[PDB]
Symmetry: C4
Subunit: 335 residues, 4 copies
């Protein structure tokens, strides 16, 4: 019984140890950017269209060479065994079954090859290592295992200052490890070029907020970008991605896929992102709430709920396809 994504947060709040809930929920500094992701979405109103043909409403998109059932993918979230014993396998299985891409993390608590074996056409998120050769060996592993895109996270030259974790003195339980390993260095545009030169997979730069970085990403050969302030966990005071999305979509003028994340908590939010020009969204914390609450079945229920909310919102707004939703206009309101 879940009728909104908020039902699942309460459930995850119930079950998780406090420090782990804080690791999941928290942001950096004063959490201004964390709160702003929600504020910014709540200010956006859609102008729906009426009286359109809705006899074949579809929420499917084509992205990075594959069909997805929704304009959504599961965001990279490290160490998912923190939230449930089956960790990444539970989430990847539910995503596969829902037809949603799953992003395998560099810091996954189950090896990328095991998660890829689940099936479901997965993506791989890269954090840049120490030396180019080991970074590229991670990319090669992912490609060999059947991952279909490399999501290179570019907003973490180092990790942000998460004060909840500092106050809690939070550290990984001994029962959770970085399963892809037996160290990290800041990524640069040179790093992006090294990755692009080493793979035929589309490279997606996650954590772009400046318009000129979006243009440079296209010039650098990126197949996509994720407009994102990393869920408010990196620079405290970084603008929400949803506030830069329209400008960025106009600037790249179809040169790559433009995704957005941060605070997506309903099908209506997905519609807002689409109306502002996103190709698709990522969803992070809610997927972990569902995982914590009820494992694989929990994530299944979440994705079924989001699928019904996206269909509902699209139809009510007169959109028989995600392309139509991208042509919707919006208006900024107050509170």
């Amino acid at each position: 019984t879940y009728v909104s994504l908020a039902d699942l947060e309460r459930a995850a709040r119930d079950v998780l140890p406090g420090e782990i809930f804080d690791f999941l929920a928290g942001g950096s500094g004063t959490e201004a950017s964390l709160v702003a992701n929600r504020t910014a979405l709540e200010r956006v109103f859609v102008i729906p269209r009426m009286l359109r043909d809705l006899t074949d409403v579809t929420t499917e998109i084509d992205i990075f060479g594959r069909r997805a059932a929704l304009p959504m993918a599961v965001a990279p979230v490290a160490y998912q065994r923190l939230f449930h014993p089956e960790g990444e396998l539970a989430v990847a299985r539910a995503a596969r079954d829902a037809g949603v891409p799953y992003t395998i993390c560099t810091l996954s608590s189950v090896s990328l090859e095991e998660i890829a074996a689940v099936g479901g056409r997965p993506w791989f998120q890269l954090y840049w290592l120490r030396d180019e050769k080991r970074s590229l060996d991670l990319v090669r592993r992912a490609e060999d295992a059947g991952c279909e895109a490399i999501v290179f996270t570019v907003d973490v030259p180092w990790m942000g200052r998460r004060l909840r974790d500092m106050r809690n003195g939070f550290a990984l339980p001994e029962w959770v490890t970085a399963a892809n390993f037996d160290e990290f260095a800041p990524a640069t545009w040179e790093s992006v070029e090294a990755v692009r030169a080493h793979t035929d997979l589309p490279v997606v730069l996650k954590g772009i907020l400046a318009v000129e970085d979006a243009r440079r990403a296209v010039d650098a050969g990126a197949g996509g970008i994720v407009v994102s302030n990393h869920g408010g966990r990196q620079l405290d005071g970084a603008v929400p991605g949803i506030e830069m999305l329209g400008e960025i979509v106009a600037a790249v003028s179809g040169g790559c896929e433009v995704l957005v994340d941060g605070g997506i908590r309903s099908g209506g939010d997905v519609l807002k992102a689409t109306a502002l020009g996103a190709s698709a969204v990522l969803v992070g914390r809610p997927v972990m709430w569902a995982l914590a609450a009820a494992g694989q079945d929990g994530v299944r229920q979440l994705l079924e709920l989001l699928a019904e909310e996206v269909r509902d919102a699209m139809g009510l707004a007169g959109c028989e396809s995600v392309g139509a939703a991208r042509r919707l206009n919006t208006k900024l309101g107050v509170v």
Copy 2:
């Protein structure tokens, strides 16, 4: 003893079963659009004019070929026997006596012919059925019974997701039925044309928010539109009608009547809507509060209160007629 519309909500809160109060009060999703209808009105301030001749102040308008006592009609609200045993008959009698149009619903709990027999020059609200022939037979029934406009609701390809109702497990009591029947399909512009071709009554499209849909409505032969997000019950995140009204009035440039609804709770709110260019408003939930609180006499008291508030507001703003009120300027403020 009621000196504001808020007095009646408290009274209805007293008497109604909780689940029924929630069916009435609620919106879809997070109720963002429900709240925004009120927020948007509260941001609007009127710039009143002084020292005008007020020796013959009149709140009357001519609309769809008939005089109305106020620039207001009772909004379509389904299943009014949910709120009082006399249901639609109580409300239609009070509206008749007040000189206000009453909108008979497709999903009325008393048959449209019985309600029309009350008198008072009624309108009929259409939800599109299954097959064109039965939809048109409903329109023909309404016209035969003396209804004077067809209010075609165009923002309900299907019903919105009302989470209060889901959580309550709300369903119609066995003692409430759709009295016009012994099934629904999404309306399209083709449906509008079928209705327009089948009746001489003015067709009014209720649920228009996009400027180009307002233009297309005029091109399609509509006699009016209602700028409306369906009281925040349909797309959660849909812009309030009051925020689109000025743009829409400019775009149709007198080509049809432009009504607005959503959150009208006083004569001052009616004045704001008029100043932004509306021909008239619809009022929904407050009429049901009055019905729940005190039946026909309750609705009578509500309409008398609104009549005095509209006269008061118009005179204080220097307007001897509703046309003068439409020429008032406004200024947006904060909170």
Copy 3:
């Protein structure tokens, strides 16, 4: 011991009967315009100037042919014996001693001739009567008694709907009467012309909010206007005067004095009004708080406090005169 105007409200709250405090404090309808007077002032920030010569700072102005000690006058407030037994005489004595104009009301609870006999160069506020001849006889009385301006209130074709008073069932105590009498009709521009033709005193139109009404006031021969929504007691939803002031000052381009009222509660507020272009302000409710709290001495303390706050604010903003303060720039902020 009062260091702010807020100290006096608490004191008046202590002493007054509840219904009388509500008559004083309240506004019309939902009190949106009452609250907005304060909101609007709080959004205004001054850009102060530094390093100016302040060796002869003066808060004096010349207005309607006379020097005033501050750019402020006591607003017309009817029936002041409601708040203290000495009523208008206490307030007029304190105003005289402070060098501030006092506005004698048509509905004063002490006769205008008695209040004028106090001295201090008083103004007279006119509500339009029944027939022109009696209205003009009131004006002639005021002029004969030595009043120096006629403040014609133009935003009261009838009194607003004050819901606190309705709920309280408030009426005048038998011990309070309209002392100028032993009936009212809406004023029009014809009424203004009748007054202008009948007196050599400057005519000041109180309750102007529309820019074209301000222009028309100058064309009609007004010596001043008060930009005002009547303390939020008339049209609920009327824009605050402070929000129209700049536009209006630009439109009259020195053709008459432009005063403002509504929510002035400190010397800093006086500075804001001046910086937006006002010649002077009126202050209403705070004067009655002081009267209720401590009679004549209370009003004296209030005016001494406001005088020190105005001097303080002007000097801190680099203004040696009120003219300099009118040349200050402002910036709108949030909350």
Copy 4:
């Protein structure tokens, strides 16, 4: 254990007598300008850049002929022995050790020569005295003692009205004195010229908010300005410096250093100020919190925390230098 500047306020709240905490925390009037300093910063969001070279991130700047370790100095705060027995010596020692300039006050509770003897290349803040000769003798003392800039405070023709202090009846303890003395007059542009003519040190005008005063400061030969409303302690209703900073930086077009203060409470806030164009910031109240909480070691911990936060924010925003941070763009958001 301090992970934010807010940790230290709580600690100082613990230890200080209430009246002294109020002297430190308070502002003038209604404290509107005090609150607005924080509001204004919270509305600013940074647009970070990604994938830059961060192999030599440095937070150092050159200002007034000397290297500073951070783009920050300790603001002038009078009478620091109010907060800890070692007063100014504790703060100046910690600032020296951190490589941050310390501003010695005219109203210091330890003599300027003693504080300068601590070392660390100090600045001297001037309040204009009585007669030019004694003002200039203070400047000469400062220069003889090795101070490296004269921070002439120009927004205090007299002290603001601090209502907390009035209500508390706050006065200096007998154990705190103005140690530079054994009287004050408003400064003017003539005063600035007298100082400029009498010293070779850069003269920095603290308390500039108007764009034309910033231009005039450059024309007057100032080496810098501090855009500031004096922590909301002077004119209540004065615009926050952070709201004028961008305009002012554009207007002086490199003609002098432009500093800002008011509400800086984190390294992220320093980044915002830099992105809006500031050369550096001043920090006032937080330094006194640290002093009250733990003396010299407390101020050391505060400056170490701010240093780590500034480095963190700069790197996360892709800035290897403060110059790069000044080229960041910003976007205004809500709440």
